[PDB]
Amino acid sequence: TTTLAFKFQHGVIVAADSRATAGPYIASQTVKKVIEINPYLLGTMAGGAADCSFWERLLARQCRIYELRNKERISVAAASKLLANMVYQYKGMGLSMGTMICGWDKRGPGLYYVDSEGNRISGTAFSVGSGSVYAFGVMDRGYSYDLQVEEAYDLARRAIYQATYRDAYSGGAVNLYHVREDGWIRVSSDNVADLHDKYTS
Amino acid sequence: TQNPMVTGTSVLGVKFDCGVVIAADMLGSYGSLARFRNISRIMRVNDSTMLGASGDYADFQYLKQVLGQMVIDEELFGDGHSYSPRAIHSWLTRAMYSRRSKMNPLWNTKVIGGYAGGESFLGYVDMLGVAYEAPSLATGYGAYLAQPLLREVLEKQPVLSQTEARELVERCMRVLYYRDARSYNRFQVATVTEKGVEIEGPLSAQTNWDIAHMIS
Amino acid sequence: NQYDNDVTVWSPQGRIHQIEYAMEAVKQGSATVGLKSKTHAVLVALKRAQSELAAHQKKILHVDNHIGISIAGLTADARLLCNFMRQECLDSRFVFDRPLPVSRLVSLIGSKTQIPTQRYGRRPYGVGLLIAGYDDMGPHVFQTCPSANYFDCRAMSIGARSQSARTYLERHMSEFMQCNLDELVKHGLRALRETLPAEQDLTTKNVSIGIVGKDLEFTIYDDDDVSPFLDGLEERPQ
Amino acid sequence: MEYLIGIQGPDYVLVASDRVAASNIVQMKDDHDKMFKMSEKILLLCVGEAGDTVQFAEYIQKNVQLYKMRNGYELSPTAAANFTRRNLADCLRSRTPYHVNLLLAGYDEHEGPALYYMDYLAALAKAPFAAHGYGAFLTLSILDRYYTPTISRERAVELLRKCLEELQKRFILNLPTFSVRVIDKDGIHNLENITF
Amino acid sequence: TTIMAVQFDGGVVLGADSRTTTGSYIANRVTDKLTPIHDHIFCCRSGSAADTQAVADAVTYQLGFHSIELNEPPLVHTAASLFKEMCYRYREDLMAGIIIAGWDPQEGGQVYSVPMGGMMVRQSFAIGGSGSSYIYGYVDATYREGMTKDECLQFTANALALAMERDGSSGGVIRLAAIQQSGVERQVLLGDQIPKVTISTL
Amino acid sequence: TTIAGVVYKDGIVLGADTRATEGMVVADKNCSKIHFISPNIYCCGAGTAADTDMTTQLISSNLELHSLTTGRLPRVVTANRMLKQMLFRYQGYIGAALVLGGVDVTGPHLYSIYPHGSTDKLPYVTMGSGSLAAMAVFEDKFRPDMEEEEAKKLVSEAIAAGIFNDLGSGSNIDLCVISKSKLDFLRPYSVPNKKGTRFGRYRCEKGTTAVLTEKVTPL
Amino acid sequence: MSSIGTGYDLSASTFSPDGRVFQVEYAMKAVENSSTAIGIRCKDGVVFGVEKLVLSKLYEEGSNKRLFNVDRHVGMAVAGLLADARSLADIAREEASNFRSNFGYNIPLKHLADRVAMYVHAYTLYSAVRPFGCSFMLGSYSVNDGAQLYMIDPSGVSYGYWGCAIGKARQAAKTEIEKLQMKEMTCRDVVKEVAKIIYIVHDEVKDKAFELELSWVGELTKGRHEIVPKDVREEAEKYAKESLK
Amino acid sequence: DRGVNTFSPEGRLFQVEYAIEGHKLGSTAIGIQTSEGVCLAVEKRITSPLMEPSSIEKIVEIDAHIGCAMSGLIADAKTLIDKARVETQNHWFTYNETMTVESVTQAVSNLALQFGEEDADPGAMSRPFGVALLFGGVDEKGPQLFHMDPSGTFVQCDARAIGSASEGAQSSLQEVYHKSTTLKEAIKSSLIILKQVMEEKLNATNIELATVQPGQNFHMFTKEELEEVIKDI
Amino acid sequence: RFSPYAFNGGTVLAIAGEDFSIVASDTRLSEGFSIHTRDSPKCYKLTDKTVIGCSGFHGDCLTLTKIIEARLKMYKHSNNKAMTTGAIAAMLSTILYSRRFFPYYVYNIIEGLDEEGKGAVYSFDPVGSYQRDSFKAGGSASAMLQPLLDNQVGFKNMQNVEHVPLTLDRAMRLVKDVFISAAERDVYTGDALRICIVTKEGIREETVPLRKD
DSSP: OOOBEEEEEOSSOEEEEEEOOOSSSSOOSOSSOOOOEEEETTEEEOOOSSHHHHHHHHHHHHHHHHHHHHHHTOOOOHHHHHHHHHHHHHHHOSSOOOOEEEEEEEETTEEEEEEEESSSOEEOOSEEEESSTHHHHHHHHHHTOOSSOOHHHHHHHHHHHHHHHHHHOOOOSOEEEEEEEOSSOOEEEEEEEHHHHHHHO | OOOOOOSEEEOOEEEEEETTEEEEEEESOEEETTEEEESSOOOEEOSSTTOEEEEEEEHHHHHHHHHHHHHHHHHHTTTOSSOSOOHHHHHHHHHHHHHHHHSSSSOOOOEEEEEEEOSSOEEEEEEOTTOOEEEOSEEEEGGGTTTTHHHHHHHHTTOSSOOHHHHHHHHHHHHHHHHHHOSSOOSEEEEEEEOSSOEEOOOOEEOOOOOOOOOO | OOSSSSTTOOOSSSOOHHHHHHHHHHHHSOOEEEEEOSSEEEEEEEOOOSOSSSOOOOSEEEEETTEEEEEEEOHHHHHHHHHHHHHHHHHHHHHTOSOOOHHHHHHHHHHHHHHHHHBSSOOOOOEEEEEEEEEBTEEEEEEEOSSSOEEEESEEEESTTTHHHHHHHHHTTTHHHHOOHHHHHHHHHHHHTTSSOTTOOOOGGGEEEEEEESSOSEEEESSTTTHHHHOSOOOOOO | OOOSEEEEEEOSSOEEEEEEOOEEETTEEEESSSOSOEEEETTEEEOOBSSHHHHHHHHHHHHHHHHHHHHHHSSOOOHHHHHHHHHHHHHHHHHSSSOOOOBOOEEEEOSSSSEEEEEEOTTOOEEEOSSEEEETTHHHHHHHHHHSOOSSOOHHHHHHHHHHHHHHHHHTSSOOOOOEEEEEEOSSOEEEOOOO | OOOEEEEEOSSSEEEEEOSOEEETTEEEESSOOOOSOSSSSOOEEEESOHHHHHHHHHHHHHHHHHHHHHHSSOOOHHHHHHHHHHHHHHTSSSOOOEEEEEEOOTTTOOEEEEEOSSSOEEEOSEEEESSSSOOOHHHHHHHOOTTOOHHHHHHHHHHHHHHHHHHOSSOOSOEEEEEEOSSOEEEEEEOSSSOOOOOOOO | OOOEEEOOOSSSEEEEEEOOEEETTEEEESSSOSSEEOSSSOEEEEEEOHHHHHHHHHHHHHHHHHHHHHHOSOOOHHHHHHHHHHHHHHHTSOSOEEEEEEEEOSSSEEEEEEOTTOOOOOOSSEEESSOHHHHHHHHHHHOOSOOOHHHHHHHHHHHHHHHHHHOTTSOSEEEEEEEOSSOEEEEEEEEEOOOOOOOOSOOOOOSSSSOOSOOOOOO | OOSOSSSTTSOSSOOOSSOOOHHHHHHHHHHHSSOOEEEEEOSSOEEEEEEEEEOSSSBOTTTTOOEEEEETTEEEEEEEOHHHHHHHHHHHHHHHHHHHHHHOSOOOHHHHHHHHHHHHHHHHHOSSBOOOSEEEEEEEOOSSSOOEEEEEOTTOOEEEOSEEEESTTHHHHHHHHHHSOOSSSOHHHHHHHHHHHHHHHOOTTTOSEEEEEEEEESTTTTSOOEEOOHHHHHHHHHHHHHHHO | OOOSSSBOTTSSBHHHHHHHHHHHHSOOEEEEEOSSOEEEEEEOOOSOSSSOGGGOOOEEESSSSEEEEEESSHHHHHHHHHHHHHHHHHHHHHHSSOOOHHHHHHHHHHHHSOOOSSSSOTTSOSSOOOOEEEEEEEOSSOEEEEEEOTTOOEEEESEEEESTTHHHHHHHHHHHOSTTSOHHHHHHHHHHHHTTTSSSOOOTTSEEEEEEOTTSOOEEOOHHHHHHHHHOO | OOOSOSSOOOOOOEEEEEOSSEEEEEEEEOEESSSSEEESOOOOEEESSSSEEEEEEESHHHHHHHHHHHHHHHHHHHHHTOSOSSHHHHHHHHHHHHHHSSSSOOOEEEEEEEEOTTSOEEEBOOOSSSOOOBOSOEEESSSSSTTHHHHHHHTTOSSOOSSOSSOOOHHHHHHHHHHHHHHHHHHOOOOOSEEEEEEEESSOEEEEEEEOO
């Protein structure tokens, strides 16, 4: 429903799509940066906006879940990452807010996708996004998106979406960091520039 | 920048340091809004035997810092086994009290000029009422930073390490000028000198008002 | 006896044996020597370990950018006290921003150590500390007891069989004062070796040095530059 | 505050409750597959309604509380007792710094009268009743039930009441809401009912 | 409010005080006595609003009372004026209370202090205070000189208060004058049938 | 709102008050006593806002009780002043209570008026509620500033009667509370200035305008 | 009695049928063990004379010192265990520092002495902690309160003295004070006297060896507690030595 | 009676001397630092086949690339390990990278001796723990094995053994284990030494091995891997 | 950005360019608290090792509080972690301050420019709200894009070949520094006196004062 960390579900994977951006949307403070951070190999997330705030809540989420997963020898789910983030952030509220992370893992009841925002919204949908400009994007994408898309098939879907998105979008100094998450692993498909993909596609 | 509303204000205090001494003129007179409650007030404090400090801005606020500095010094001197008040110690400590209050949305405003002589170094330092420390060449305080300081800086630019005497004429000159440009001034002003003897600040001495000029 | 059931138990003489008995614990610890000149404060220490097939973990601890300590006694307790001192030294650096006085820091340890010795149903801390610190009044090397009293020495040795080492300290007492950094460390090694038997002469591996002074901040040499001080051998001077 | 859309029609053949899946932040819908009726226990429901975020928040705490009584008593907790305990818990949270008005919707099995629905206002008021609406919508639906009331109403007749509402909701209401989850509850399990 | 004043005497102090504190039209205290003690060493004359002065007045009384009995010989006045400072440092953006402290301690010898509502404490010869009791600037300056004679000081205080009550509105009714020596406070009450009336302002 | 005065006379202390206790300018109740009797020794008049005054008297009464019993001294009005000043500060200067504390010590009878300020206020003779100055102003006028007890008691009653006449808020009976330090004579009817007209004629109705379908007693 | 596991020396809440408290008494025997600290009131100041115990051969000045500055113008000489003395220095210095801050005048010795004594006395009452094993003197000059000398023991008493001794030799040392007129007498002459008393009282079994430390707080220092000059110490040392012969 | 807090004329505390003995009571654990990685081996020593051998653990993770074998009272150690888990991830929030073997070990050791039996806070120990921990992992710096004692003396090791065989095993390690012995050979050295304290022969249900090797995270050896080292001892 | 209210302003503008092992950090040589500049001398820059050089600017009250703290965090890090201060010191400090300043809005941009204790050069940029990133261009102050661009155009060489056809050397960066400072005075009117550029290497600290042109 908004950008900055966004995910949509498939059976085979989830798509992880994110921006590299510095500051507010009015200027960058750097050009080289990747804001993409790997908190656990369960999935990737990274935002922007109120910078301290996103990093703080995810770092708590990362601490709790990772200790529990690693020691217990029981894999934590989509539901668990989401519950930790939710419980923490409402408490901390009044100390700036703007967390926009997308939680993925495969569970006993099948693949589960929950969208975590800083209001305290916790949502499953066709595609969800939290941050800013993807709000427009969910409209075109839904049409070109099946319930279950293959990984390869999904990579081609991202390339077209983006290539039109750069033409519409007027935010510069970004990269589209593309990751497919095959469950409790995370691999990086490509980290292609938004300026490159308009020519290709 | 913000500053609290000031009632009793200390304003224009110059300080320029010469070898193993500093000369200062600070007003001895603190107006409270309008009425000059104390024409006899002392903005000069004794941290220890070879330190002095002189402060401007809200006079009230200056007294809060004096006590904290005072209680810390009282415990630390007298024993002098290796611990006592030292030139670096007074500057930083006083800066932190000011920082502590900077964290709150109301800060206690005084802008201070430390001249000290510690364990081996003669120091002339500037402390702010929100914090910050540095060694300084010449600094003004309160109203002196906006109004006279640049003409004082200009005299200093050929010779930055001149004598007490040359400083003494400038400072004596500066009160006739104080009256002319700013209002909440008196011409009974205090001459403070920090030396190796101690911190001396005799009573208010005066010279001409000189606002009787009209020649164009 | 029953002059040492708790650290509140007085003897008719008017002495708590547990605080005294806590000093006997310092003798179980490893030999450390503290020496000062007029520009450096030097700490010479014995490191021991259970694996000598592995590098020996330092017995010199970090307190400030010009303060280092050498412990003799209880290892956990010395580290335990160290943290109170470390917190204060680093805090002193924020607030006061002088290079903190050895005499000032040491008295604050005296207030905390007094707490359990004053308190019933507790043990004193049986660790003796030699602190090297350099402030702007020059070096000081101070000894702090298992009690709470301090000595400002020019040279001190507390630890195992420390008497043997003092015989050296008594003999070159005049010399310490004039020295530069190099000279302080060679004397402390010659002292250090004496504690131990006649036929054991130190290696660099089990020697850690914490050097403090006017020309330097805080550097710990574990074998780094230990080899030249050790050179010029002298073996157990009686 | 009331500007959701709930209706619950109590009978003792069934109790039909429906809600929209339409938790919307920004301009699009974060939930539109998540169910808006939460499972406290396998025969008990709480439906939390208010702000989008505050809804998810109310349920998780409550879920722990229902189950806990089940454990403590060693039987299913009393319906009357739970409903009152859910009212004390929503008033306690009201005191706390974040002010939370929450419309709760209690479905319980009671010793009488049969299948029962106990009704909760945004005055944080527990009330026994038959014929209820939650949300801004409560006001029209309670009134339609009032013209034609039955509290032992069969399932066919429940569909007729529903359909006169659904066409009205589509053109006269600000909730055209083609995305709805509708469920009819017998005393043993949750059955899914037709959606218009 | 009240005209309060204290002028420094021979080695001790001469006081003046009014008897009304007014909040505009409504009298906060119809009767105000600022001659009473607050220990036997120190006395103060309290000005500003009624509530701001009263709260300060009871704490300096408590601290001072404990200090003379605990020490065994009485405390000095310089302590009393610092106790008032502490309070004002908290209340320097909300309330204000302009206290002017005078008496004499035996132990270190005579003191005249002004502790302000911003918090300061400084030694003066004579200070007169209140908001509308600042209108005697000429009067205080001409009257006070360095070591003024006791007979002159007595007349000048009564005379200054009179100029106040007539000219400022806030002032009014019985002037309470107090002359203090080393261990004793002696008060005289000057009629409000007596007042010297202002001469031709029209 | 309320019209309360208490006086220092040549006898002891006479408190005068109108009955009515009002929540604002409208009567919550037209019965009871505005001037309240506490322990035997302490009487307190109440004025200004009702909500703030009744509760202040009540809370101080516990404190004063503890102090009286332990100390075994009779209550002092200066003492009473300090307790109200400290309590009201604790609350943070919320609400309006002009309070009239009056108690007899072993010396003279002593009367004080404490407004809500949290002042250390010494009167001479005072009246409270309404506007503090406005009520106080009367005392200077009718009292020559000391006259015999009986003459003074008719005088307060007469001055308080005038405030009742001028300000219709006060209504019903005027009570005089003659207070010593063990004798509390509560004279309901010192003067009745006004009273209502009889509610003799009904506005009752038979059931045919509203009816009843139940009469049962649950168990 | 002294060997026991319940009460007596474990407690101090205990009373004997005589009324005694043994623990508080054991604390008193502890102050006795080390050498004497004397402090003499003049009508113009206090002069101390302290034996400063030489416990090694690698001494520097101020090592194991017993002279503390409680306040700017208060000096404190301790006798008995130095462990307990360091904690007592922190508590006394702290009560004084806050006093100066608030009152803004020189701490009256009568007040300071009452507060430290209360603290010692709170421990003697308690069986929960032991009481300090030292006895101390506080001595001072001011013109706001005069020259004052006070003494606080392990029990928790504060009374003023005009010349006091704490430590082993105190019964002998005190006698020498009755000989001297010291109530009226310059602080310059009294330094000569404290030095000669100490040299004669010392013997090689109260403690091995000492370093003479005298201190000023009087008309000479102008109301400052400072250590005496190198000159002053040596002439007073000399007079001690000449009287010793 | 006399207290336990007291120092003895030997010059050591009573409670602490008892705690070392507590280390000696339990099962033996070997932690060997090789420069190819750090292996931790522990004996299961099961007496019943109804037990499920996976869930007998005595190797627990401080970190995701540091493993720890613990000895003496199994229960007493577990608390120290619980506090350790919170610190390692906490370290990730602040530094923004994972905790070292050295940092974690010094922080737990401060807690090890704090003991005041009477008149000490209930949020602090009345008695010390009788556990010796062996923290073995490879971290940013490289393979490190640190040893922690119940006396709160921490030291760096390359080969350390603790448990009933603690003195015997430790001597025997110094002999075979050197830094001219590879990682797989370290696993063979530990297995031989293990047998005297064990009641039976070595098996793949009677050892549990886990190795943390460079460039890899902590791996718990599977039944096949345990069995390959069993074949050649 | 924000117009000084929360904390005192003290102006100043920071430019940062990273090469490969040489990094220039420049800020103006002034201490301000008031509209006038007190003294040219400053202690905005503080070095902790030759390995790391930190610059805190703007408000002077902020500048002293955090910089000393950074010296404390360094000390702690060498002891416990056993990695000498550098990159590791830098990531840690930016989180704790940026929480501290951002509810009551941040008026200092601290920039840690160093080498890691394992090696590889990092130049780190906070907005004022916690982020750390490695950069080869950086602009920081209210004018957080005014320098950024020159480093983007000249260093990166994206649609540019006339500053270098590749990427700048050490000799080239120092030449460019003097030029950039002369330029800044023209655009930004919040400076007085002198501009100080410190060049941070793993092997040489350099300092140069340069007059305001």
